[PDB]
Amino acid sequence: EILEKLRSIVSVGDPKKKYTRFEKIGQGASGTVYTAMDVATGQEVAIKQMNLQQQPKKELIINEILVMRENKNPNIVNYLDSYLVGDELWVVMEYLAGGSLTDVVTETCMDEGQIAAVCRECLQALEFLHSNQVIHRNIKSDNILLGMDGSVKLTDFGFCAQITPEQSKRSEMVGTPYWMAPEVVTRKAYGPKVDIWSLGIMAIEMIEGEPPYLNENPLRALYLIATNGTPELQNPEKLSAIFRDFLNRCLEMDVEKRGSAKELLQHQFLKIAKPLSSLTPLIAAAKEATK
Numbered sequence: 001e002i003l004e005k006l007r008s009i010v011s012v013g014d015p016k017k018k019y020t021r022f023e024k025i026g027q028g029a030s031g032t033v034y035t036a037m038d039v040a041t042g043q044e045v046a047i048k049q050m051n052l053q054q055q056p057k058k059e060l061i062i063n064e065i066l067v068m069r070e071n072k073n074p075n076i077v078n079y080l081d082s083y084l085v086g087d088e089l090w091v092v093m094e095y096l097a098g099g100s101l102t103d104v105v106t107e108t109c110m111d112e113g114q115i116a117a118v119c120r121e122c123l124q125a126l127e128f129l130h131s132n133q134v135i136h137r138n139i140k141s142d143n144i145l146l147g148m149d150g151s152v153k154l155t156d157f158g159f160c161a162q163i164t165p166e167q168s169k170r171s172e173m174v175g176t177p178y179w180m181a182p183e184v185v186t187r188k189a190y191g192p193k194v195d196i197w198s199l200g201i202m203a204i205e206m207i208e209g210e211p212p213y214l215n216e217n218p219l220r221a222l223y224l225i226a227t228n229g230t231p232e233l234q235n236p237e238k239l240s241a242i243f244r245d246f247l248n249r250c251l252e253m254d255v256e257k258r259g260s261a262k263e264l265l266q267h268q269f270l271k272i273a274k275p276l277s278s279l280t281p282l283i284a285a286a287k288e289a290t291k
């Protein structure tokens with residue numbers, strides 16, 4: 001039906017014999033991730049395997065492969081190929097040894113310098129998407145991958161949306177409750193700045209270790225978000241002033257006053273970024289903590 005379009009995007013042939021030595025490195029929602037070995041040419045890959053029946057809205061699987069294949073960028077995980085295997089779609093990507101930003105924010109303490117360096121590379125990914133008319137809608141530490149060179153890349157395009165000058169705003173109540181911007185949570189028309197909000201939230205995770213209200217349930221977080229607006233930090237006096245300033249412009253209630261990704265890339269806060277090799281001690285720490 002609309003699945004006819006899906007079957008025509010995919011490459012054909014045996015992924016189970018183009019690739020081997022499969023271990024689970026991850027299991028998200030409609031995403032089991034494996035690493036594997038390309039028997040031909042030798043390279044190591046990440047393959048995401050998704051059950052077709054779990055996703056009723058197949059137009060999102062299509063939109064996922066398209067956006068990734070059409071918006072390649074050094075701060076986005078690299079799409080290689082895809083395959084339909086029975087009741088399951090396999091997406092193949094370039095593997096990056098490293099871990100999730102989630103492992104770092106939950107197991108280590110980041111300094112301002114490291115936080116600024118992550119924020120800068122995420123803002124580069126978002127300025128690129130936003131200029132190509134794509135909103136991610138699911139920004140969070142869990143969708144940021146850090147390489148063993150200190151590479152920072154954005155992943156997980158399954159929720160993203162395309163806009164145009166004619167349909168410049170979206171209205172679907174989509175995202176992960178704790179990172180969602182109030183305009184989304186309260187069903188108003190919204191734009192690429194919802195990702196800036198989410199990025200503000202992720203900067204909170206890097207400070208405190210968790211998005212605000214994580215101990216609450218998802219529906220409660222949604223109410224809290226609708227009712228507080230701008231979240232508050234447990235301990236604001238621990239942050240520099242320019243960093244408080246940066247948060248403030250990421251977490252503005254007025255969409256008009258909230259920064260754009262282009263704007264925020266000029267913020268003085270990112271001037272303090274460490275070099276990205278600053279991040280590899282974190283990754284090592286995180287790997288040790290999760291052993």
Ligand SMILES: N[C@H]1CC[C@@H](CNc2nccc(Nc3ncc(C4CC4)s3)n2)CC1
Nearest residue numbers: 025026046093094095096098099100142143
């Ligand atoms: N949502 C996140 C994204 C997948 C990731 C799986 N865990 C992981 N662990 C160590 C290294 C590593 N590198 C990757 N490179 C490319 C990868 C492509 C998007 C699958 S994953 N991934 C963490 C869950």
